[PDB]
From TrEMBL, chains A, B:
Pfam assignment, any one: Abhydrolase_1
Domain AB hydrolase-1: 29-208
Transmembrane parts of this sequence: none
InterPro entries: AB_hydrolase_1, AB_hydrolase_fold, Epox_hydrolase-like
PANTHER family per UniProt: EPOXIDE HYDROLASE
Protein name: Probable epoxide hydrolase
Taxon lineage: Bacteria, Pseudomonadati, Pseudomonadota, Gammaproteobacteria, Pseudomonadales
Aminoacyl-tRNA synthetase as UniProt keyword: no
Top-level taxon: Bacteria
Protein's organism: Pseudomonas aeruginosa (strain ATCC 15692 / DSM 22644 / CIP 104116 / JCM 14847 / LMG 12228 / 1C / PRS 101 / PAO1)
Keywords assigned by UniProt, alphabetized: Hydrolase
Gene Ontology molecular function terms on file: hydrolase activity
Length: 298, 298
């Protein structure tokens, strides 16, 4: 019965390599919120309004997801580094050279790559559920690959996964969202229609496969280069993770401490879909982190 | 320009739990040849005629593949152990209580499980490309899961993979066969039409998913129980493998020596599809192995 994103102004930004859908609200220090797969900026609908009471809030559809599209309709770059440049250009266009980044799922992957590549631009970074892909790949075993089968399917060469997931897009979308939510009734029916309409667009499905392809390839190469160079995130980092068992060496707080000198975080008793499943818990942690690092935002 | 399976007699066997398509030819000691995924008994067309000059040759479609079907059209068992019982019943019906087994791909998985469960029935065992699933699962890493993505896709719960692979069955079949052959022109056009017609049958596709599901679950459990018990194959074993690099502990000859006291084998410079890609090399090795162990066949 609350409206979706009350008072958010919907924009379409024309950047060097993309046409990006953005929604903005608020004043004060800037926050960029980046959704994940197979979603859009509406995934933040339970979080963004509260944040916009105290901050400048920018919500974006990732390149190729939702209503955002690459201008190169044949061979665009959907690597995290390219999407990180999109974020620089987006925030710059809106008046911000330095900003906090809050990401979930693929959006957190864009976010950390942004922070690594462009440390002057990232005041603080929050990851919901994500650790760097280098660490994920090192952890692959039987159970991982069964649970996260789509990491392998969607990364197969063009156009195998596009043919398979494109056959009955809405069925695959619905199946995937239910599975990611552990069957919990977390999707606002109207947000859902938005996710569905995006997924019915073959270009969106292709951009999602390209994301997964990049994760295998160039994104992992970029992480390795940073590890080799000893390059770490320079800002405060918060990681919010799903309450579940983590193998030795796999705990998200432990992993982030190998990538950044200033790390904190908390477990949340919800599914992978933290923005929609546990918005009040997420907000409590986010608000406290941002307040505690108000000097970093300056 | 040679006919397919000249002089083979096509039978349909009515077993306790299945209706099985069988093709037989020859006299002398019995050999049971078991094809793999996504194929049928026709995969042996370049090998079986030569063997039938000197042996009793039995070719079968695995339960649910090709023209073989489970009688339980709702909830059949497609575990390797169940398909191994099918082989006992098949060979018994034809007059054989003890026989050699030559398997490729999923058929070799049926074969080794038969040998373990029913050592009195298996005179000798030949595996083309396969090691026990327990060993495969222990080797899962990033590259394995990308290369063998279908092991993970096809094992997802009912009916996810059936929906995806069933959308355009012939396209997926053709793609998969090309990939497995490394693009080599190895499929006789008429054998191909047979593989295609089977794959167009939703029941066949479902039985294939069930095979992959069993591989994750009960088949692996069965291997572990044998390992725990110290149970090994009791017959001579030959393994013919694809010439490629194998990680330490992963070489097929080394692995089979942990499962059997009498093991030999050879590399063949071909794709995974050894029966069709390298029939002359396979025959040279098979004939020599069977001749060398003629006493075991008695």
């Amino acid at each position: 019965t609350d409206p979706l994103l009350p008072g958010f102004d919907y924009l379409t930004l024309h950047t060097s390599a993309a046409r990006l859908r953005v929604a903005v609200k608020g004043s004060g220090p800037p926050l960029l919120l980046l959704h994940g797969y197979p979603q859009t900026h509406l995934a933040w609908h339970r979080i963004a309004p509260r944040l916009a009471e105290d901050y400048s809030v920018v919500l974006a559809d990732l390149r190729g997801y939702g209503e955002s599209r690459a201008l190169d309709e044949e061979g665009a770059d959907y690597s995290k580094a390219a999407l990180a440049r999109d974020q620089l250009e987006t925030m710059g266009q809106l008046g911000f050279e330095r900003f906090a980044v809050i990401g979930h799922d693929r959006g957190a992957r864009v976010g950390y790559r942004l922070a690594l590549d462009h440390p002057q631009a990232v005041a603080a970074f929050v990851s919901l559920t994500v650790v760097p892909i280098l660490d994920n790949w090192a952890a692959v075993n039987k159970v991982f690959a069964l649970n996260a089968y789509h990491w392998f399917l969607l990364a197969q060469p063009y156009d195998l996964p596009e043919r398979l997931i494109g056959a009955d897009p809405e069925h695959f979308l619905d199946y995937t969202l239910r599975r990611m939510a552990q069957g919990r009734d977390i999707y606002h029916p109207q947000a859902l229609e938005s996710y569905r309409r995006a997924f019915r667009d073959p270009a969106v499905r292709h951009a999602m496969c390209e994301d997964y392809r990049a994760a295998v390839g160039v994104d992992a190469d970029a992480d390795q280069a940073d590890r080799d160079a000893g390059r770490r995130l320079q800002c405060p980092v918060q990681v919010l993770w799903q309450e579940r068992p983590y193998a030795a060496g796999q705990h998200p707080l432990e992993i982030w401490k190998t990538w950044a000198g200033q790390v904190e975080g908390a477990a949340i008793g919800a599914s992978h879909m933290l923005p929609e499943d546990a918005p009040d818990a997420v907000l409590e942690h986010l608000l406290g982190f941002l307040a505690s690092h108000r000097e970093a935002l300056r």
